[PDB]
Design a protein around this nucleic acid. Structure first.
Ligand code: ZLD
Ligand code: CL
Ligand code: CL
Ligand code: CL
Ligand code: K
Ligand code: MG
Ligand code: MG
Ligand code: MG
Ligand code: MG
Ligand code: MG
Ligand code: MG
Ligand code: MG
Ligand code: MG
Ligand code: MG
Ligand code: MG
Ligand code: MG
Ligand code: MG
Ligand code: MG
Ligand code: MG
Ligand code: MG
Ligand code: MG
Ligand code: MG
Ligand code: MG
Ligand code: MG
Ligand code: MG
Ligand code: MG
Ligand code: MG
Ligand code: MG
Ligand code: MG
Ligand code: MG
Ligand code: MG
Ligand code: MG
Ligand code: MG
Ligand code: MG
Ligand code: MG
Ligand code: MG
Ligand code: MG
Ligand code: MG
Ligand code: MG
Ligand code: MG
Ligand code: MG
Ligand code: MG
Ligand code: MG
Ligand code: NA
Ligand code: NA
Ligand code: NA
Ligand code: NA
Ligand code: NA
Ligand code: NA
Ligand code: NA
Ligand code: NA
Ligand code: NA
Ligand code: NA
Ligand code: NA
Ligand code: NA
Ligand code: NA
Ligand code: NA
Ligand code: NA
Ligand code: NA
Ligand code: SR
Ligand code: SR
Ligand code: SR
Ligand code: SR
Ligand code: SR
Ligand code: SR
Ligand code: SR
Ligand code: SR
Ligand code: SR
Ligand code: SR
Ligand code: SR
Ligand code: SR
Ligand code: SR
Ligand code: SR
Ligand code: SR
Ligand code: SR
Ligand code: SR
Ligand code: SR
Ligand code: SR
Ligand code: SR
Ligand code: SR
Ligand code: SR
Ligand code: SR
Ligand code: SR
Ligand code: SR
Ligand code: SR
Ligand code: SR
Ligand code: SR
Ligand code: SR
Ligand code: SR
Ligand code: SR
Ligand code: SR
Ligand code: SR
Ligand code: SR
Ligand code: SR
Ligand code: SR
Ligand code: SR
Ligand code: SR
Ligand code: SR
Ligand code: SR
Ligand code: SR
Ligand code: SR
Ligand code: SR
Ligand code: SR
Ligand code: SR
Ligand code: SR
Ligand code: SR
Lengths: 56, 72, 237
RNA sequence: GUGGAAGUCUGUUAGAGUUGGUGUCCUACAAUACCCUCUCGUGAUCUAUGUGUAGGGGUGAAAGGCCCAUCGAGUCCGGCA
RNA sequence: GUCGGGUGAGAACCCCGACGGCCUAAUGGAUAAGGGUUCCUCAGCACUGCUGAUCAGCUGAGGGUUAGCCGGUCCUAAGUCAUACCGCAACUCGACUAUGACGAAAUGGGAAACGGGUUAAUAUUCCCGUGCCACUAUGCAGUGAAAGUUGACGCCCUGGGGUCGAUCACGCUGGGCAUCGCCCAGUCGAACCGUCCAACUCCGUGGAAGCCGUAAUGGCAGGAAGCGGACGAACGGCGGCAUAGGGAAACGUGAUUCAACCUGGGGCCCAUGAAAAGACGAGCAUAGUGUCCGUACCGAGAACCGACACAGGUGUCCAUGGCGGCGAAAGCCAAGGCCUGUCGGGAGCAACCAACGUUAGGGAAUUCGGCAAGUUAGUCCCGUACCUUCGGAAGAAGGGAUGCCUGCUCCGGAACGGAGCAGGUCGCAGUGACUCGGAAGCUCGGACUGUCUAGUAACAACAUAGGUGACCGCAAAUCCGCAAGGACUCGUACGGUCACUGAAUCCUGCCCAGUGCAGGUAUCUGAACACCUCGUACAAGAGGACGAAGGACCUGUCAACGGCGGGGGUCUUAAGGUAGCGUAGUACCUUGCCGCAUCAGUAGCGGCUUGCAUGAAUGGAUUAACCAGAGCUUCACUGUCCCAACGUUGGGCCCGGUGAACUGUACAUUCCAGUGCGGAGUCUGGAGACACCCAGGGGGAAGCAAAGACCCUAUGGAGCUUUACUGCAGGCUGUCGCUGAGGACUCUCACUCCGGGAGGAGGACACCGAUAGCCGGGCA
RNA sequence: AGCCUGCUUGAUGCGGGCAAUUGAUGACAGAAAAGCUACCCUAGGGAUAACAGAGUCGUCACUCGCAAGAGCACAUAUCGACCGAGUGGCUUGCUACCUCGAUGUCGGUUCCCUCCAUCCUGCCCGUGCAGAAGCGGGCAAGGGUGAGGUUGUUCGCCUAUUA
RNA sequence: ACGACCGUAUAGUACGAGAGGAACUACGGUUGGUGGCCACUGGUGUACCGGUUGUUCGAGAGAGCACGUGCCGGGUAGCCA
C-alpha cells in the first residue's frame, strides 16, 4: 500500500483542537497539551527566542 | 503426532507421541486407587471418579524426582 | 552506530516488559508471628501465567486466602502448615534448621523472611545437605553448594510441573504463545544478519562475525555481545 | 465403525496479499491507480478503537525497512546573510 | 436509454407516464469516525457543476434537531495527569512511592419502553394507548442484612430446547393471466404482567456383581436403571395486554428445516483466556421527583481523508428474500435503489490503437524462456508408480459414467434430504450456459506454515523448531538513567541473559603459533596518595623505597576469530584437509573428456575429476513433504510462429458545446556534398522549391522532460570500518574522604541489606564523593 | 662563555633574555594523521575517462612489386617464404579535438538506401582442360544469398536443405 | 517486374579402354519476387436459421438476461489466401 494517497484515507482521528487558554486549534486532545501556548504543560506561556531573528 | 502430517521430522514427533502417550494413559489416583486421573492443564491432574485435583509433572502425574521426596 | 537491541531492553518499553497486569500472585512464604500454629487447607490448584507451572490456593485458619508455590504432590483438601513446628511432609514450610538433612527442598529464602528466592522453577529442587547452629549448606539446582542462615525458610518437596522441558516446541507458533507470557522480545534476529550500524557483528559481503566472539568483562554496553567473558568455548578438551 | 486433530488441503465466503502480463495508464481516475492471472484464508491469522515507545533516539521475523508523499539519522523555526 | 407529455423566454440530460435497462455483502437498510447545516421550504442562475439547465450538495431568504427508561453522564482496562516526596545549576525536565483525578458515545461493564399515530423537515424524545425503573415522602409489613450469588469472560467439536425467516399442506381475503389451471400478495397484533420447564445439581425410594446411557466421551455397591421429589431456561410456549392498534378485505391451522436467544456434553494449553461500579440477597400501597449534554443531514464512483463533485482510501450490523448448487460461489430474479461510475450529434463507421470472438493445414518451427493464449475442469465408479521421515506421495497416472421422461426400491420420523433399479427417449454436444486441475520426469536451493525492501527486488535473503557455546545463586548476569531511580521481575538455573548454527537422518577430523577471552604467576615491568633522601628558612623540582589491576611469562580454550600450503622419501607459520562432496549458484583454462537425448543441444542429466580458488554448526553429506523460488526433458494443446484474414465493443474521422498543458533567441520550403570546435534547416557550391489546409506513421531538429546519478577534480558533505590521529563515556584496580574500637587479625558505633517489629546478616568493607593506572570504534 | 633582567626594598631559590653549537621535519622553503561507500549527497569539469564522432594506422583487412622454393621435369595450372611498396577505415591500440544545465548499452527484431575486396546467377581466359566434376583467373553489384540445435551472445560450432 | 532452379526430348549420344558422361535448341513444371481477382477450395461472417443449459415473464406460445453471440451446429453477400 502506498504512503501517499491511499494512506490518507485512514485519517479520521481528532487530535489538535481549539484551546481553552489561547484560542488556537492546537490543543492536542490525546495529550491534553497545547502545542501553541503550552496549556496543560506549563503555567507559563509557551514562548521561544527562536520564533524571531536573533537580533530582533 | 499424526496431526503433524509429514512435518517436523521423526524425533520431534516421536517424542510428542511417547510423551502424550504416557500423558493420556489412565493414571492411578493417589487418593482412591482407581486409574481415572486426567490432566486438566500444565502440571494439573484430576480424578474423574473422586474429583481429587492435584499437582504433578507437566506431562505425567508423577516425576522421578517427585517420587524421591517420599523416600527420604 | 545505533543502540543494539540489548540496549533498547533497558529502557523498559512495552515491547520488553512482562505482562504483569496479567500475572496472578507473588508466591511468598507467609509471615508467622511465631509458634507455627499456622495451617491452612488447599482450596484449589491453578495455572501460574508467569512460571508455566501449577500453583496452589490455600485458605489459612485465620482467614487469609493466598496462592502458594506448590511442590509436586499437593492436592485439594490436603492440609499445609507453616512454622517452626510444622510437620515434615511435602507442601509444608519451615526454616532449614527444622528440616532433616537429606530432604529435597524448594522456594528457599536467601535471607530469613524474604519469602523465598531459590529453586522455584518447574520440577526443580534444592538439597539440604549439612546442618549446624550457624550455617545450613544447601545444594541448589545449578549444582552449587550454597551456605545459608539456618533461619532461612523453605518448602519440603520438589516444585510441581517437572519435565516441562522434556517436550519440544515443535513449531514456532508454540514458542510464540509462551513468549507472549514473558518479558521477552521474540523472535531473535542474529547479530551477523544485521547491518554494521545495528550490531558489532553486522556488515560483510557474507555473514560472519567481524572479530572473535569472546568479549571482555569490561566491555561497555553496546559492545558486550557474543560470548561474554567466556572461560572457554567449544566442546573439545 | 466412531471420533474430528491440523501454524493440514480446496475455496474471488468475509477478509488479507500480490507471481506474471514487463498488459492499460504514465500533463493519469490516481504524486503508486485499472484489469486478468496468481498467493493466504483456525492461525506466528486478519481487523477497529484506545494506549505506549521520539530523533544519534524509537520501532525493526533485518530490507538500512518504518517513525504523517520526508529517513545511511524526521519535521519546524533558530544559529544564518 | 427511447417515445409521448408537463413547466419555462429557453429543455438530450428538471418533472409525469409508458416501453427498455442497471445494482443483490450492494448502487439496498441502519450507523461509528470525520464533516458541520451540507437537512426542509420558497425564490433564483452572476458563481460552482467535465456540455446544457428551468435542476442541484450552488446563490439569497426563512425554517428544522423536543427523551426518567437511546447514548453521554456512572465503573474500572492498557495507560495518563495533578499534588506530595526526591533529583536537577534549574525548570514547562525526571524515575519510584503515596493520595486524588483522568482514561471505553459503533465495539468492555451498566437500573428502566413498547405499539401506533403525526410533520415540509424531529421522534423508543412530540401526541394517543399501555408498561417499567430509581430515589424520596407517607402507611402497612419487616428485624432480618451479610455470608453468598451475580456483574464475569479463552480456543476447537457437538447434543438438546427454540423464535424470525424460508418452504410444504389445506382454508379464507384480494390481484394477475386467459386454450390449459396456473401464478403472485395478504391472512397481522408489542413491551409488560402471569404462568409453564428441558439441561445441570441434589434428595428419598430402589438394589444392578453386568447392566444403564450417548452423536461421542462415558456411569455405578463410595449405590446403576426404574419410581417419586427439591432447586431450576429462553429475546421461547401459553393466557392477559386487545369490543388497544393496524388492515380495502380475510383478519388461518398444521408441519418441516430452524439465525436469534436459552441450556448442556466433550477436547486443548511449556498459551490459562480483565477489572471495578452496580445488581441480587431484601415485601407491598399511594404520591412526588427524575435536572444537565447529544439528537438535523451525509456516511461516500458528489456531504469523510486524499488541493477536486478524485476509478484511491475509510470501521460496524443487516451472513436466513426466490431459483440454483456443496455453498455467504456463478448466473437469473424479488424487496429497495438507480438510469449521476453524468456531454452530446453523425459516417457500414477508412488507416491506426485498446479490449475481445473465430480462423484451414502444420503444431513451439516463435522467443532468452510456451512470455501471451490455450489445454484440463464439477460429481460418481474403477484404478494408481518411483520414493518416503510410513504421515505422505495422490485428485499421481490412466479408464468409464453423467440429460430428459414413466414406474419404482433402499436409508431415515421426515424433508420441498440422500443412495440406487427397470423401461422409454432426444441432441454434434447432458458439470450442454455458468461454475470448473492440464499431466509426468530429472536437477539446484531453502526443511515445513510464517517474514521483507509502503512506492522497480517475495528470493536461495529474515524467522522458525531443533543443535550448541557463553554469563549468572538473585545484594546475581544483561541492560536504561546525569541523578532520584528503572526494565528484566507477581521471574530464580526445568530460569533468562548474550551469541552462533538452522527440521529429520548419517556425521562433525587436525591446529592454541598469531588474535580474542579466561585462569595462574617465582621473577621482571607497573600510577597516584602516604613514606624516606637531596634541594628550598617554605615551595617548585630531582631521586628512592613499596607495588594494585594490566603487561612480560606460563596454562586452558576453535560448535572463539580463523588456518589446514610449497618442497622431499622437512620449511613458513600451529597444523597440513580426515568422512564426504566435486567442472559445483564454488572450476580460470571451458563449449574440459565419455555417455544419454536431438536431424543438429556453449543447455540439461549421469559418470570421470589433478578441486585457478570444495569440506565439516565460517557446519559437511543427504533428504520425504512443502514452494507465485532457478535450470532441463516428455505427453497434451494452441494464431507464439509459418502468414496472415474476417468480425465485435470503445476510441480514432465529421458536427454542436466545453476547453487546458508541454514548448518558443531569432530566422526557417529543403536536399546533396563540402566546410567549420573534427556530428550544419541558417556558412560555401550546386540541386530542388507556387501558397495554404486535412489525415498518418514518427527519419531529423545530436527533439522535449532532469545544472550526468558514470568518470575525474574540491586542502566539499555524510553513513560505515579499523591494531589511522586525537579524545570522551563505561568497566576493572590502587589511593583519600565518609571512617570508629582493640602484612596479617578481632570487634561495634557510623553506613548497607533482610525483617511488620523484636531482631538478624554484614561492617569500617561495601555504596557514594575525589583522584590515579589499565582496558576502552560503545561514542565524538 | 660573559653579560643584561624579574612588579616598594634587601637576601636566597627558581625564572625571563642577548650570541652561538647540537637534537628534525627525505611530502626535504617543515600539519601531529588510516580506510570503505553499489545507501550515497553537493559543487563543477568535455580543464579529465567510459559509448559514439574525429585524427592516426603500429594492429587489423585487402592489394601490389620481386620470386627463393615445390609443383615426378617444369617459379608463374596451382601453392608460394623473405624482403620491399601500398590501399581501406570492418578489428584493436593511441590521442583527448567535440559533447558531462545528459549524443540512452550489447545482441536481436522490424524497415529503408548503399559499397564491392563477387558466395550464386550471366559472359569469358588458363589448366597438371578427353568427358563429367573441379582448381585458378577476368568482366560484372540486375536479382538472390533462405530454415534450423546449444549460447543473451556478436562470433562460432553443429544439422538438413540450396544455384 | 521480373530472378532462379528441377525435369523431359537432345542422349545413355559427343568424349572415353572403361567407369562415367555433357551441349546448342525446343518443351513441361517448381520456387522467390510482383500486380490484380473471388467462378473454384478455404477462413470469417456478434446478417440470418436451428439445437440446447440456468433463470425471469404462471404453463404453452413467444421472449429478456448469462459482455458486449450463454454455449453448440450450419452459413448468404462482402472482405479475404
Ligand atoms: C544517457 C546519457 O548518459 N547521455 C549523455 C551522453 C553519454 N552517452 C553514453 C556514454 C557511455 C555509455 N556506455 C555504453 C556501454 O559501456 C559503458 C558506457 C553509453 F551507453 C552512453 C551518450 O550517448 O550521451
Ligand atoms: Cl523458552
Ligand atoms: Cl447517541
Ligand atoms: Cl450430550
Ligand atoms: K556528455
Ligand atoms: Mg512470588
Ligand atoms: Mg510481549
Ligand atoms: Mg535467529
Ligand atoms: Mg542485510
Ligand atoms: Mg558498530
Ligand atoms: Mg548462515
Ligand atoms: Mg557464517
Ligand atoms: Mg492499535
Ligand atoms: Mg545492504
Ligand atoms: Mg426548487
Ligand atoms: Mg429522519
Ligand atoms: Mg462523480
Ligand atoms: Mg489453424
Ligand atoms: Mg530462432
Ligand atoms: Mg504462462
Ligand atoms: Mg423407510
Ligand atoms: Mg547448475
Ligand atoms: Mg522457505
Ligand atoms: Mg518494492
Ligand atoms: Mg513469494
Ligand atoms: Mg538462511
Ligand atoms: Mg532450547
Ligand atoms: Mg536455536
Ligand atoms: Mg537454544
Ligand atoms: Mg557437466
Ligand atoms: Mg533522440
Ligand atoms: Mg549537474
Ligand atoms: Mg560512484
Ligand atoms: Mg566525511
Ligand atoms: Mg529496601
Ligand atoms: Mg568515528
Ligand atoms: Mg644538545
Ligand atoms: Mg617543497
Ligand atoms: Mg626548490
Ligand atoms: Mg553531483
Ligand atoms: Mg578535451
Ligand atoms: Mg572487381
Ligand atoms: Mg542494386
Ligand atoms: Na480410528
Ligand atoms: Na496483481
Ligand atoms: Na536525528
Ligand atoms: Na447530464
Ligand atoms: Na414468558
Ligand atoms: Na438457497
Ligand atoms: Na498457511
Ligand atoms: Na591459536
Ligand atoms: Na576452508
Ligand atoms: Na511462500
Ligand atoms: Na488472434
Ligand atoms: Na520525427
Ligand atoms: Na552517507
Ligand atoms: Na592507408
Ligand atoms: Na549483383
Ligand atoms: Na545458432
Ligand atoms: Sr482511522
Ligand atoms: Sr503536564
Ligand atoms: Sr520563553
Ligand atoms: Sr519476591
Ligand atoms: Sr516481600
Ligand atoms: Sr560481519
Ligand atoms: Sr574437538
Ligand atoms: Sr491453513
Ligand atoms: Sr486456500
Ligand atoms: Sr516484472
Ligand atoms: Sr491479458
Ligand atoms: Sr506507474
Ligand atoms: Sr471451516
Ligand atoms: Sr537560516
Ligand atoms: Sr441564462
Ligand atoms: Sr437536498
Ligand atoms: Sr470517567
Ligand atoms: Sr456499551
Ligand atoms: Sr472468537
Ligand atoms: Sr435444533
Ligand atoms: Sr437520525
Ligand atoms: Sr447510510
Ligand atoms: Sr468507495
Ligand atoms: Sr489502492
Ligand atoms: Sr425492483
Ligand atoms: Sr451534467
Ligand atoms: Sr461461426
Ligand atoms: Sr521452444
Ligand atoms: Sr527453438
Ligand atoms: Sr478423467
Ligand atoms: Sr508489506
Ligand atoms: Sr540437521
Ligand atoms: Sr590463544
Ligand atoms: Sr582428500
Ligand atoms: Sr543442508
Ligand atoms: Sr500522430
Ligand atoms: Sr587495508
Ligand atoms: Sr551491492
Ligand atoms: Sr586509461
Ligand atoms: Sr569495380
Ligand atoms: Sr559463376
Ligand atoms: Sr559488435
Ligand atoms: Sr566463442
Ligand atoms: Sr538432360
Ligand atoms: Sr554406365
Ligand atoms: Sr447479450
Ligand atoms: Sr464448457
Amino acid at each position: 500500500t502506498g504512503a501517499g494517497t491511499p494512506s490518507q484515507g485512514k485519517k479520521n482521528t481528532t487530535t489538535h483542537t481549539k484551546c481553552r487558554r489561547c484560542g488556537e486549534k492546537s490543543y492536542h486532545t490525546k495529550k491534553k497539551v497545547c502545542s501553541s501556548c503550552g496549556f496543560g504543560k506549563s503555567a507559563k506561556r509557551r514562548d521561544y527566542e527562536w520564533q524571531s531573528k536573533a537580533g530582533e | 503426532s499424526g496431526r503433524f502430517g509429514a512435518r517436523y521430522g521423526r524425533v520431534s514427533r516421536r517424542r510428542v507421541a511417547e510423551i502424550e502417550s504416557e500423558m493420556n494413559e489412565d493414571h492411578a489416583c493417589p487418593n482412591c486407587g482407581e486409574d481415572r486421573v486426567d490432566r486438566q492443564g500444565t502440571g494439573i491432574w484430576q480424578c474423574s471418579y473422586c474429583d481429587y485435583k492435584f499437582t504433578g509433572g507437566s506431562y505425567k502425574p508423577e516425576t522421578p524426582g517427585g517420587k524421591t521426596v517420599r523416600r527420604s | 552506530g545505533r543502540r543494539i537491541q540489548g540496549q533498547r531492553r533497558g529502557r523498559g518499553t512495552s515491547t520488553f516488559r512482562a505482562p504483569s497486569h496479567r500475572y496472578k500472585a507473588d508466591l511468598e512464604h507467609r509471615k508467622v508471628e511465631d509458634g507455627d500454629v499456622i495451617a491452612g487447607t488447599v482450596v484449589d490448584i491453578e495455572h501460574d501465567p508467569a512460571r508455566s507451572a501449577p500453583v496452589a490456593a490455600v485458605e489459612f485458619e485465620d482467614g487469609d486466602r493466598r496462592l502458594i508455590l506448590a511442590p509436586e504432590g499437593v492436592g485439594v483438601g490436603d492440609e499445609l502448615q507453616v512454622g517452626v513446628s510444622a510437620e515434615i511432609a511435602p507442601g509444608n514450610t519451615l526454616p532449614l534448621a527444622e528440616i532433616p538433612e537429606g530432604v529435597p527442598v524448594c522456594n528457599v529464602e536467601s535471607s530469613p523472611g524474604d519469602g523465598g528466592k531459590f529453586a522455584r522453577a518447574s520440577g526443580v529442587n534444592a538439597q539440604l545437605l549439612t546442618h549446624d547452629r550457624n550455617v545450613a549448606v544447601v545444594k541448589l539446582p545449578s549444582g552449587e553448594m550454597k551456605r545459608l542462615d539456618p533461619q532461612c525458610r523453605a518448602t519440603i518437596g520438589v516444585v510441581a510441573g517437572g519435565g516441562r522441558t522434556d517436550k519440544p516446541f515443535v513449531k514456532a507458533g508454540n514458542k510464540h504463545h509462551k513468549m507472549k507470557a514473558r518479558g521477552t522480545k521474540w523472535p531473535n534476529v542474529r547479530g551477523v544478519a544485521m547491518n554494521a550500524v545495528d550490531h558489532p557483528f553486522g556488515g560483510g559481503g557474507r555473514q560472519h562475525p567481524g572479530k572473535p566472539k569472546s568479549i571482555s568483562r569490561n566491555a561497555p554496553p553496546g559492545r558486550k555481545v557474543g560470548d561474554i567473558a567466556s572461560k572457554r568455548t567449544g566442546r573439545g578438551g
